[PDB]
Design a binder for this molecule. Sequence first.
Ligand code: CL
Length: 97
Amino acid sequence: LYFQGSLRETSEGVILSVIVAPNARETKIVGIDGTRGRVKVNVAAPPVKGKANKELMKFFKKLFGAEVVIVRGETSREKDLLIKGITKKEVIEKLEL
Ligand SMILES: [Cl-]
């Protein structure tokens, strides 16, 4: 039930709600924010020229084996990611690895 506060399933896939910090030592999940309902994700890329966005999408596409797009928050730390064609059960399994 830990990651469930950060995601919801629509007809298209799963919307995963994240809050990023760029310039990190490693791209990885570091926690969850209970009030905001977001996964805290550190991103090992600078927030310039879209590079942290690119790294975030690359990281989750690899984890989920599915296309990941930023549907909201391109220029924000709070971003909603659509993981296309995946189920909530599948996303929870992968986040719990
Ligand atoms: Cl960026």
